């Protein structure tokens, strides 16, 4: 005859959820530089990231209702402004500028500004009068020579981030606490959902730059074998699509110009990094990448449609639809400055079965909402001379046509632009459980009188 | 052997009885975004001192294993020792068990220590 | 929301062979979803034929080698279905055929214990006569 | 096999009654797995409670069971006319899942 006999600490988990807490290293945790992007009270990352593999166990694992994405939502937004309150509010900014096509011989059809404005100096009575170079997504006219004004004026209180404080992202560890743990989904053909054959616990991720970008990912994880294809529904066309590449892909983004900051005393204690004028040759922005990976690139991602859809088919890439510019463009931090690119030509193709490189056009904005949230926008202030940062591309994110023509051919173009999509990249392989180590399982044991 | 944290999981409870002491170990493991690293740990104090309560307050007061003279009601997943402890797993078993755990737990703490532990008393009283 | 759509009513003769089919739309996945089938008799109970769980097919014992059972994932142009198809087929077959949709994603649900399950969404049915 | 006897085979009530349905098996099922479904004429049968007593979501809270050893019953107070029809209970202890004679819940005259 059984009895209930309790024991304690047995392998019995349940699925939950809970706060989780960052490691950046130690060796982004140097560059200080008065709070460099993120980095400032994270948790160092374990010397030795154990990872230990369970045996036996089937566990369903599910990147798209994972919550460890929302919380690096919020975080990195909450992060943002504690670095722009300390930093210098940009409000009084918003003025009637006396602008003027930037100087350069004909051959045009500007973008650049001289900006001739009446401002304020530390001393309250006495004034500024004070020019400064624009770009043109940063103001708007207003209806002699034509006047200007911010675009945020009439939205959102300014603020600038002091330019101690970088964008850099920095690899960021997600950890979770005792009670709790973290699973790795380490199976290489992985479409993120339903069950993962490969489960292994670790307390902490791996490294993840909380890279702020739309349209591409920088940076991050590489896949393995084939490169996969991850989506929650794919019958969906609204629903966003992931991939990941096992072959990371080279691009050398640059700012040309070579810029002048110029830092006018808005004070006591506050003060602005306005643009001064460049020296030289005027370039624009812009970024090179390999035509030839490229064209292979294309060649065995159609190989692996063709496992999810037809055996034979066609595939065709045209540019983005429409909406705003951090969506229809290509949004990053490259230093201290944030590119907005034109991705076209990538895209200009049409597949059906069986030596140079490429360029791309950018452009830079300073103030930035980004994550829409009004009431609050920031400027980026801008950083001497020419800017290069190279970057390694991890990941994507696309988005389906529409019914069109039956069974003849689906069309695919940049998407996303809701950051949740950027950590679900480095989070595919990621959950989090609960340990219930009481249980009560029958035997022959009884306790005594 | 040293199978880590969780890492008798998938075998069945009569050999994954030897971990009880490992994962009863990795319990408890000893300005703003300074306050993402504080709330967490709050958690597992509260999560070990419920399971050395509820150990308290059953027939057991000591840890890893226990006995019961609570009867295994034949309302309650009607198994063998080979069918319990052999044939399946601890989340398989407490799978099973989700039902009538509670039914199970009254009789710990009522039916043992309001009564054993009221005759302890009663019995060294002299 | 979910609808399970299965095939048209089909009239054969014993000794042939059928296939019914079952549209499965709503559901995200047969990973998440097991499809169960279960026959019912004219006006008398019903009886579990088979299942595809985990990718893994299944017979009753009585349906043992007699019946097959498969499904796909969705196309890009349509959602995922399971399919029903019977060998030698006598007057005693003779039943309305019944597609199961029920979530596997929760170990703890209830809904299924070990690969033998209930059944949570169900589909209009197809009538299958067999007679000469 | 399991074989689920159903009790009673045709039973007769009015709107707001309370009325009873027995199912017993010829093991006893301790994990309570044991099914509950409507079937009205010629359209699919519908889920209503799973697990001896769960209810599955949206299904009224008119419809309770109850499992105790071997015996199963379905409870439904307060009849109403959308609940007239055929019911059946199901196991799913063991493989292959069974299911029931059934039974007919007719309106009285």
């Known amino acids: 005859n059984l009895w209930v006999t309790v024991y304690y600490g047995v392998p019995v988990w349940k699925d939950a959820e809970t706060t989780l807490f960052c490691a950046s290293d130690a060796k982004a945790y140097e560059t200080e530089k008065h709070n460099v992007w993120a980095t400032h009270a994270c948790v160092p990352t374990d010397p030795n990231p154990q990872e230990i593999h369970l045996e036996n166990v089937t566990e369903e694992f599910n990147m798209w209702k994972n919550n460890m994405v929302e919380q690096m939502h919020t975080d990195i937004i909450s992060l943002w402004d504690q670095s722009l309150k300390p930093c210098v509010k940009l409000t009084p900014l918003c003025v009637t500028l006396q602008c003027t096509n930037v100087t350069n011989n004909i051959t045009d059809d500007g973008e650049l500004k001289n900006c001739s404005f009446n401002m304020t100096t530390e001393l309250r009575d006495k004034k500024q009068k004070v020019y400064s170079l624009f770009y043109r997504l940063d103001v708007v006219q207003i209806n002699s020579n034509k006047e200007y004004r911010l675009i945020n004026c009439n939205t959102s209180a300014i603020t600038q981030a002091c330019p101690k404080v970088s964008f850099e992202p920095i690899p960021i560890h997600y950890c979770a606490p005792a009670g709790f743990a973290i699973l790795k989904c380490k199976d290489k053909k992985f479409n993120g959902t339903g069950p993962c054959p490969s489960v292994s616990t670790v307390q902490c991720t791996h490294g993840i730059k909380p890279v702020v970008s739309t349209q591409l990912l920088l940076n991050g994880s590489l896949a393995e074998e084939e490169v996969m294809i991850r989506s929650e529904n794919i019958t969906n066309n609204a629903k966003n699509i992931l991939v990941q590449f096992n072959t990371p892909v080279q691009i050398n983004c640059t700012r040309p110009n070579n810029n002048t900051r110029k830092s006018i005393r808005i004070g006591p204690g506050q003060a602005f990094y306005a643009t001064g004028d460049i020296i030289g040759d005027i370039r624009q922005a812009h970024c090179n990448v390999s035509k030839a990976t490229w064209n292979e690139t294309l060649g065995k991602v159609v190989k692996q449609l063709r496992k999810h859809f037809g055996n034979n088919t066609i595939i065709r890439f045209a540019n983005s639809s429409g909406g705003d510019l951090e969506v229809t463009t290509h949004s990053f931090n490259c230093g201290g400055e944030f590119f907005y690119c034109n991705t076209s030509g990538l895209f200009n193709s049409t597949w059906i079965s069986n030596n140079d490189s490429i360029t791309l056009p950018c452009r830079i904005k300073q103030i930035i909402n980004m994550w829409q949230r009004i009431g609050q926008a920031m400027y980026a202030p801008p950083i001497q001379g020419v800017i290069r940062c190279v970057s390694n591309i991890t990941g994507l994110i696309l988005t389906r046509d529409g019914g069109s023509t039956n069974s003849t051919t689906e069309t695919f173009r940049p998407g996303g632009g809701d950051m949740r999509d950027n950590w679900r990249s480095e989070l595919y392989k990621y959950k989090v459980v609960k340990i219930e180590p009481l249980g009560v399982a029958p035997t022959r044991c009884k306790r005594r009188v | 052997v040293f199978l880590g944290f969780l890492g008798a999981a998938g075998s069945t409870m009569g050999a994954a009885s030897m971990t009880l002491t490992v994962q009863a170990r990795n319990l408890l493991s000893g300005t703003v975004w300074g306050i993402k690293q504080l709330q967490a740990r709050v958690l597992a104090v509260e999560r070990y001192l419920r399971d050395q309560q509820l150990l308290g307050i059953w027939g057991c007061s000591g840890k890893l294993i226990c006995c019961t003279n609570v009867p295994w009601n034949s309302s309650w997943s009607n198994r063998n020792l080979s069918e319990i402890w052999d044939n399946m797993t601890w989340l398989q078993w407490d799978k099973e068990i989700s039902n009538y755990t509670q039914i199970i737990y009254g009789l710990l703490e009522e039916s043992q220590n309001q009564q054993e532990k009221n005759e302890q008393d009663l019995l060294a009283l002299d | 929301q979910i609808h399970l759509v299965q095939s048209g009513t089909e009239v054969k003769k014993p000794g042939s062979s059928v296939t019914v089919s079952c549209k499965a739309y709503?559901?995200?996945?047969?990973?998440?979803?097991?499809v169960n089938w279960v026959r019912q008799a004219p006006g008398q109970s019903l009886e579990y034929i088979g299942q595809?769980?985990?990718?893994?097919?299944?017979?009753?014992?009585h349906f043992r080698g007699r019946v097959l059972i498969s499904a796909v994932d969705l196309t890009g142009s349509s959602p995922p279905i399971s399919s029903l198809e019977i060998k030698n087929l006598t007057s005693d077959d003779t039943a309305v055929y019944f597609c199961?949709?029920?979530?596997?994603?929760?170990?703890?649900?209830?809904?299924?214990?070990?690969?033998?399950?209930?059944?949570?969404?169900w589909g209009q049915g197809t009538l299958i006569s067999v007679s000469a | 096999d399991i074989q689920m006897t159903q009790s009673p085979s045709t039973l007769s009530a009015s709107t707001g009654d309370t009325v009873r349905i027995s199912c017993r098996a010829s093991?006893?099922?301790?994990?309570?797995?044991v099914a509950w479904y409507q079937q009205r004429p010629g359209k699919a049968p519908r889920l209503l409670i799973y697990?001896?007593?769960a209810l599955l979501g949206g299904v009224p809270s008119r419809f309770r069971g109850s499992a105790a050893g071997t015996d199963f019953t379905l409870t439904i107070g307060n009849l109403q006319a959308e609940d007239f029809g055929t019911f059946y209970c199901?196991?799913?202890?063991?493989?292959?899942?069974?299911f029931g004679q059934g039974t007919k819940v007719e309106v009285k005259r």
């Open positions: 093991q006893s099922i301790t994990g309570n797995w």
């Open positions: 199961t949709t029920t979530s596997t994603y929760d170990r703890w649900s209830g809904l299924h214990h070990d690969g033998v399950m209930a059944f949570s969404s």
């Open positions: 697990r001896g007593a």
């Open positions: 199901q196991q799913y202890d063991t493989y292959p899942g069974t």
């Open positions: 595809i769980w985990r990718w893994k097919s299944s017979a009753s014992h």
């Open positions: 709503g559901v995200n996945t047969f990973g998440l979803y097991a």
